[PDB]
């Protein structure tokens, strides 16, 4: 509800 794909990897 805040930012899509927020659990992005590095």
């Amino acid at each position, epitope marked *: 509800q*805040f930012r899509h794909d927020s659990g992005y990897e590095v």
Partner: antibody
Amino acid sequence: EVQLQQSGPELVKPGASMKISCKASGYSFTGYTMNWVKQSHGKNLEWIGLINPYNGVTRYNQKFKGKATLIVDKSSSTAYMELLSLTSEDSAVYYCTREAKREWDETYWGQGTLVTVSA
Amino acid sequence: DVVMTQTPLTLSVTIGQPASISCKSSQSLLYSDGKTYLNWLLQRPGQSPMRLIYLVSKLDSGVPDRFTGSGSGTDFTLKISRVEAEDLGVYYCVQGTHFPFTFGSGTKLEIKR
């Protein structure tokens, strides 16, 4: 369909630690990041942190560092938030939410869990 | 942290009349990918919050076309072209561009009759 079913309300004593659960169903659990949100007195909303169940990435609001611990149980498609060292000000409604993966994805909220910290 | 300032605190509108509410951020919500992660939520009496608008102006599925979001940078606006009784509740803006994500303190829409 997609549902986020949270723990029922809890009475917990100050100084204990206690777990909230958020059981996800209707979608690929590891495909979406889960967020946790605090709402005090039906007023202000605060973002606690997020956890990506696929890769274990876990980001916290620094305000809640050392108060909340986020884990997942992929086997049961359940997200958990541990609330540590409980005090009166942890009394609140806690929500889990499912984030979008693609831009066009729907987002979802659990029904909330009312925590009362009291002796 | 990004401070989200919503005005007014409450808005009272007659059925059929327009509504406008403001959300201002203390920092730009423009992210490095060119997108602006500003969202509008509505929390109705007794319910969980639900998102109505994302990326400033995109309507979530099922949301009436009476709702429009606009803005850029640090100044954002939610408008209702004609208010219906079912629109009442508390409207929150929430930003997802900067960690930690932060919410406005809400505008309560009240219906006049």
